[PDB]
Amino acid sequence: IVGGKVCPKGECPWQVLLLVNGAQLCGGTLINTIWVVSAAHCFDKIKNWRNLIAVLGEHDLSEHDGDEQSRRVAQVIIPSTYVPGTTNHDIALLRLHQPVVLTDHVVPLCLPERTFSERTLAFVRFSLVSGWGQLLDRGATALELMVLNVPRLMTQDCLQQSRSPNITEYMFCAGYSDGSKDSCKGDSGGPHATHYRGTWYLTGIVSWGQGCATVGHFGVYTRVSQYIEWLQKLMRSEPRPGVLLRAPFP
Amino acid sequence: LICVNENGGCEQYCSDHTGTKRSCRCHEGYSLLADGVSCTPTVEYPCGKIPILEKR
Numbered sequence: 001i002v003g004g005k006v007c008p009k010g011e012c013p014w015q016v017l018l019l020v021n022g023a024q025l026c027g028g029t030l031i032n033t034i035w036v037v038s039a040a041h042c043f044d045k046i047k048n049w050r051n052l053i054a055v056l057g058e059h060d061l062s063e064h065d066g067d068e069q070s071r072r073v074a075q076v077i078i079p080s081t082y083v084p085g086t087t088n089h090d091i092a093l094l095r096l097h098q099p100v101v102l103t104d105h106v107v108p109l110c111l112p113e114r115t116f117s118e119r120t121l122a123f124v125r126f127s128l129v130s131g132w133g134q135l136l137d138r139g140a141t142a143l144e145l146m147v148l149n150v151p152r153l154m155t156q157d158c159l160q161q162s163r164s165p166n167i168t169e170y171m172f173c174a175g176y177s178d179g180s181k182d183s184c185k186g187d188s189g190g191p192h193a194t195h196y197r198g199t200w201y202l203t204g205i206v207s208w209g210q211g212c213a214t215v216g217h218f219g220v221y222t223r224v225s226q227y228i229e230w231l232q233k234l235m236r237s238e239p240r241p242g243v244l245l246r247a248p249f250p
Numbered sequence: 251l252i253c254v255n256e257n258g259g260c261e262q263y264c265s266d267h268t269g270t271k272r273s274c275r276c277h278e279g280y281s282l283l284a285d286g287v288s289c290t291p292t293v294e295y296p297c298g299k300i301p302i303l304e305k306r
């Protein structure tokens with residue numbers, strides 16, 4: 001995250017850190033005790049699928065304070081329409097091997113109904129984006145979880161204001177064109193969270209952009225409203241052998 | 251009321267029905283109050299709420 005601030009410990013309780021052999025991979029979002037939503041592109045180059053770990057209740061990566069909970073990732077589910085190395089349909093649903101325990105520091109974000117998300121949430125101007133990604137373009141990643149308030153654009157206005165891949169109906173833009181404030185590579189997969197009447201909801205996934213905080217460009221986020229029904233169906237399904245699952249979309 | 255305007259007056263989710271009818275609904279971990287619009291937690295850690303801030 002560029003141009004944000006430290007999320008106070010416990011104020012981003014749905015944030016997930018994904019690790020591969022101990023190393024930072026991506027962020028994600030807890031949406032109930034065993035399911036995490038992340039970006040498909042985070043998994044393009046995975047070697048050993050059996051060393052993927054999700055950590056909840058994380059804040060300062062330099063220390064252990066006892067609020068962290070780690071789980072193995074039992075399943076990574078990606079839509080059939082996702083093509084590795086490209087930007088469209090950038091969403092993954094991850095099943096944890098054992099539930100996390102909800103606590104003051106570990107709470108899921110609400111996965112909204114589609115209609116509510118499209119008719120109401122899509123019109124809330126500002127939303128929060130978070131992660132332990134780069135603090136600057138070409139710079140070091142964060143040791144403490146960072147957060148940034150970013151405004152959403154209608155895609156017509158995004159394209160008019162930008163100066164790439166297409167912005168599809170499965171995406172939306174948010175942020176700033178002056179190069180001051182953005183999510184960044186290492187924030188991939190993390191939440192774009194939207195407040196409405198006292199409750200926060202999952203509306204986007206940190207997906208892609210041009211460099212980070214590049215003048216003339218906005219952040220591009222996966223439009224989670226397009227995937228509610230797909231996610232809900234998968235969350236009712238039985239696990240299948242083998243970590244990676246490609247599931248039909250729609 | 252209609253769900254596309256002002257969220258049908260609902261705090262959370264909204265369904266249109268046949269007639270000038272509307273039903274509000276709540277996410278798991280919440281229940282709907284007698285006003286027919288408001289949602290109150292039914293569990294300790296409902297989704298989308300931040301405990302340290304709810305405590306204050």
Ligand SMILES: Nc1nccc2cc(NC(=O)NCc3ccccc3)ccc12
Pocket residue numbers: 041085086087182183184185186187188206207208209210211212213214218219220
């Ligand atoms: N908001 C933002 N502003 C600028 C740059 C960004 C780069 C981001 N991450 C990546 O681009 N990862 C690589 C990738 C590869 C294949 C497909 C998709 C992404 C994520 C978010 C960004």
Ligand SMILES: [Ca+2]
Pocket residue numbers: 058059060061062063064065068
């Ligand atoms: Ca820690």
Ligand SMILES: [Cl-]
Pocket residue numbers: 049242243244
């Ligand atoms: Cl496997």
Ligand SMILES: [Cl-]
Pocket residue numbers: 115253264265266
């Ligand atoms: Cl409806």
